[PDB]
Amino acid sequence: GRYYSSKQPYVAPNDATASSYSKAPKGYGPIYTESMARHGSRGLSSYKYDALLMRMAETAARDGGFKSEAIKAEFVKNLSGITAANVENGYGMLTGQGAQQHYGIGERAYQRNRSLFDQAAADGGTIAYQSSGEARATESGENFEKGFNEASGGRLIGNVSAPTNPADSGNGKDFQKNPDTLYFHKVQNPDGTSKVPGTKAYDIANNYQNFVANDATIAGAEKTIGDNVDVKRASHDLLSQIFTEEFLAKLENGEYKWYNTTDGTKKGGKNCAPGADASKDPDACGEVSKKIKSEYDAAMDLYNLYIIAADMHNENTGDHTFAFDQYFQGAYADDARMFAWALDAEDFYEKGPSYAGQNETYSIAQPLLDDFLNTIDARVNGGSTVATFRFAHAETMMPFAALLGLPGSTQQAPASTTDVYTYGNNEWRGESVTPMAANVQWDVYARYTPIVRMLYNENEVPFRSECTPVADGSTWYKLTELKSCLAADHKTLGQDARI
């Protein structure tokens, strides 16, 4: 692999996959479809990794911490380039790769359900578009819409439900903001509003944040992985291609430390990326509390730049080109793998299945699962919405995948801070659980209880093993069966799930 972790660009299905999805059993025709997809490829989400590395670079230049003038120039040039590229694109914004990803996904979404949507055009069915409110999610949705309308020759353009709370009045006017199902991990919503204290959504978000902040097993496992001897040596060795031993030893013993502030000090005030308009791009001014205090921190920042570059192909142009893969060549390639583990670990423990004996890390996805089922009910009871397409985040997909027990997210780590999650003992990978444009789609047919089939990153998958399908070897499941087997006790209806 290349070890891009959760910044892995989307891998679209080849034509054989997209044309070989299973057919529903005889007598069942399509009545509904729905989706939740992560935003497509993006730039850096804020002036953070590049910011901190530039502060470190300024100190190394002042104290002679670079190994040579050529190495200094190379490092500073790459930092300046990726920062300039993100300033032009806007921090947190979708890239050309992400637009292409979602355009293809929307094309294939219409194509898989051509019958459903042609009939919906025939009899006034409506399509519901939803976003978290974050710009990159809404933009992903807009490109999905473009691809969907291209593949259907525009025949469904006048079949979109008008939002009651649109993401914006221009390109995003078709997108209902729904942070309760697409941004359930934080009290604050992307549009600046906040979830109301006392509400179910506020309770979910707040209790989650307090649990993760205060949980001793998560903190201990993450300490164990951060202090791992091989991880520490990889951090030091990666940085030793750039900085001198004196500089790095000073960093590791605590003599150097950098905050994301104007002069790198804890008290230094807000730091915005050079050339950026903070009023138009607030994300270009970083969180003042982020810091580099160890070789691990600096190396992980460098690794994050290496992996985000994989999502910035079309922006890596002109006079703001950049490259960081030269720091991960040969013997350093494996270093990336180890950083991929460390990053993945932080997500696994904080946002995914995490450790055994708890469900607080992934139960927060319950509203989304609730909506996945409720919308189907609305269609069965005679509603006219034939499709619900939602666009959100990795923070949405990780607990959603763990809650459903999707492939990759079925295995919790031991209740231990030393016997911890590893690539060897656990199936979870960020590159497969939540790549850019990661998406779950359900197709719902009916004769009788409806039946449901799932695609995950457009691979047809069974539901979790506890669920019983309509027949042996089938990927179609009774809606009653899903309501039973996706609940906390994961009870199957047994023979009653068969048709």
| Residue 142 annotated as lining a ligand binding site | no
Under a CB-based contact definition with an 8 Å cutoff, are residues 24 and 453 in contact? yes
Residues whose CB is less than 8 angstroms from the CB of residue 294 and which lie 6 or more positions away in sequence, other chains included: 226, 235, 251, 252
Which structure tokens are listed for 280? 């138009």
Under a CB-based contact definition with an 8 Å cutoff, are residues 417 and 221 in contact? yes
Nearest to 5 by CA among 422, 345, 262, 312: 345
| Residue 236 annotated as lining a ligand binding site | yes
Residue written as token pair 């473009």? 146
Nearest to 499 by CA among 25, 33, 23: 25
Which structure tokens are listed for 424? 């060897």
Nearest to 298 by CA among 68, 73, 52, 74: 52
Strands 451-456 and 439-446 turn out to be antiparallel
Query: What residue ranges in 172-310 does DSSP mark as E strands?
Result: 175-177, 258-259, 291-292
How far are the Cα atoms of 52, 57, 190, 345, 443 from residue 181, in angstroms, in the given order?
Answer: 33, 41, 13, 25, 19
Integer Cα distance of 474 and 453 in angstroms = 9
DSSP states along 363-430: GGGHHHHHHHHHHHHHHHTT-SEEEEEEEE-HHHHHHHHHHHT-TTSS-PBPS-SSS---TTT----H
Question: What technique solved it?
Answer: X-ray
| Residue 222 annotated as lining a ligand binding site | yes
Residue written as token pair 């009045």? 169
Reduced to 3 states (helix: H, G, I; strand: E, B; else coil), residue 291 is strand
Which structure tokens are listed for 311? 């999502």
Contacts 24+ apart (CB under 8 A), 488-491: 488/359, 490/405, 490/464, 490/466, 491/466
Reduced to 3 states (helix: H, G, I; strand: E, B; else coil), residue 268 is coil
Integer Cα distance of 59 and 100 in angstroms = 40
Under a CB-based contact definition with an 8 Å cutoff, are residues 403 and 427 in contact? no
How far are the Cα atoms of 85, 282, 423, 431, 437 from residue 44, in angstroms, in the given order?
Answer: 10, 13, 26, 17, 15
In 10 A of CB 23, how many CB atoms? 9
Phi, psi of 386 (to 5 degrees): -95, -15
Which structure tokens are listed for 16? 């054989």
- Of the CATH numbers 3.20.20.20, 1.10.3470.10, 3.10.20.30, 3.40.50.1240, which one belongs to the domain with range 5-41+99-207+362-410+422-461? 3.40.50.1240
Nearest to 243 by CA among 115, 403, 60: 60
Residue written as token pair 């069966």? 481
Integer Cα distance of 373 and 82 in angstroms = 42
Reduced to 3 states (helix: H, G, I; strand: E, B; else coil), residue 459 is strand
Residue spans of the domains in the chain: they are 5-41+99-207+362-410+422-461, 49-91+230-351
Residues whose CB is less than 8 angstroms from the CB of residue 309 and which lie 6 or more positions away in sequence, other chains included: 82, 316, 322, 323, 324, 325
Q: What is the dihedral of CA 471, 472, 475, 478, to 10 degrees?
A: 30
Query: Which secondary structure element, helix H or strand E, spans residue 245, and what is its range?
Result: helix 245-252
Strands 126-131 and 175-177 turn out to be parallel
| Residue 490 annotated as lining a ligand binding site | yes
Angle between helices 216-226 and 333-351 (to 10 degrees): 180
In 10 A of CB 275, how many CB atoms? 11
Nearest to 28 by CA among 474, 342, 491, 326: 474
Residue written as token pair 């979910």? 204
Residue written as token pair 């993945």? 344
Phi, psi of 218 (to 5 degrees): -60, -50
Which structure tokens are listed for 74? 């190379």
Under a CB-based contact definition with an 8 Å cutoff, are residues 390 and 37 in contact? yes
| Residue 350 annotated as lining a ligand binding site | yes
Contacts 24+ apart (CB under 8 A), 203-206: 204/363, 204/364, 204/366, 204/367, 205/364
Nearest to 271 by CA among 54, 2, 86, 78: 54
Q: What is the dihedral of CA 491, 495, 498, 499, to 10 degrees?
A: -130
| Residue 335 annotated as lining a ligand binding site | yes
Residue written as token pair 């989650």? 208
| Residue 237 annotated as lining a ligand binding site | yes
Which structure tokens are listed for 185? 């991990």
In 10 A of CB 36, how many CB atoms? 26
In 10 A of CB 403, how many CB atoms? 23
Residue written as token pair 């034939």? 386
| Residue 295 annotated as lining a ligand binding site | yes
Integer Cα distance of 12 and 98 in angstroms = 12
The widest CA-to-CA distance across the chain, in whole angstroms, is 76
| Residue 39 annotated as lining a ligand binding site | no
The number of residues making up the chain comes to 499
